[PDB]
């Protein structure tokens, strides 16, 4: 029953991990139903804010780097693959490889 509950979560997470690859590698947030961990609004700390409930509790370690990764992509845009595995952190490492670039394009954009 541990091979089973890994077959469900591997398939019940493809939709969530397909809105994430749009919020990190780009700035757009689709989320038609209110389910994503990052929601937007309409001076800059109230633009995007974490929702605490809808956190996968296995990305809870990096709940601040995700929100900080897309946020840097938007202050430049308006100016001008991930798979789930157990006991393997190939996606936790995959997020740090993009946040470490998300800043190097904005920080350089201001210097």
């Amino acid at each position: 029953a541990q091979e089973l509950c890994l077959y469900l979560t591997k398939a019940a997470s493809a939709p969530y991990f397909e809105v994430l690859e749009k919020w990190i590698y780009r700035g757009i947030i689709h989320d038609p139903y209110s389910e994503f961990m990052v929601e937007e609004h309409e001076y800059w700390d109230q633009r995007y804010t974490i929702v605490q409930q809808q956190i996968p509790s296995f990305l809870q370690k990096m709940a601040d780097k995700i929100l900080s990764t897309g946020k840097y992509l938007n202050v430049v845009r308006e100016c001008g693959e991930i798979i789930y595995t157990l006991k393997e952190r190939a996606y936790v490492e995959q997020i740090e490889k993009a946040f470490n670039y998300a800043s190097k394009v904005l920080l350089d954009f201001l210097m």
Binding site: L4, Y7, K10, A11, A14, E18
Partner: protein, 158 residues
């Protein structure tokens, strides 16, 4: 130690329990048979001719694996030429299989009825195994329970 590597080989194939003279006689069968061939074509091609016969009877991905290893074993040739000789001598799940209901971007297919037809044979073989067991378990013990007094018993054979 070519004179010893044939002595260690003769030990492994010896089934565990006179175990001191049989090894002396089996080393004869090793030598009596080694010099018959000596008295009397590429390498990778022989695998493909066995890769073909795999794909025909189903089990495609396994055949795509057999070729996946011989491609990395290049970067020894006479070793795989020995395995292809003994190909037939050996002794006789994953939910992320077809499962059109899970994926990121699954392509349009329409009904198949050729995956569900080979998903009921996966079950029919199960109910036909746990039924031969009950045919090979009530037989192995009724052949002894009903016989002449003292046939299957080893202590009466003393």
């Amino acid at each position: 130690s070519i004179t010893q590597l044939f002595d260690d080989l003769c030990e492994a194939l010896l089934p565990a329990a006179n175990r001191k003279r049989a090894k002396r006689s089996l080393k004869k069968v090793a030598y009596n048979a080694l010099f018959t061939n000596l008295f009397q074509l590429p390498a990778r091609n022989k695998i493909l001719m066995l890769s073909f016969d795999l794909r025909v009877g189903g089990l495609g991905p396994k055949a795509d694996r057999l070729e996946e290893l011989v491609e990395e074993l290049e970067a020894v040739g006479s070793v795989l030429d020995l395995l292809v000789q003994l190909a037939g001598s050996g002794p006789p799940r994953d939910y992320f299989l077809n499962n059109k209901h899970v994926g990121r971007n699954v392509p349009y297919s329409g009904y198949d009825c050729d995956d569900l037809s080979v998903f009921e044979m996966d079950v029919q073989s199960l109910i036909s195994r746990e039924e031969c067991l009950c045919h090979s378990m009530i037989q192995e013990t009724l052949q002894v329970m009903e016989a002449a007094p003292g046939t299957g018993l080893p202590t009466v054979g003393l």
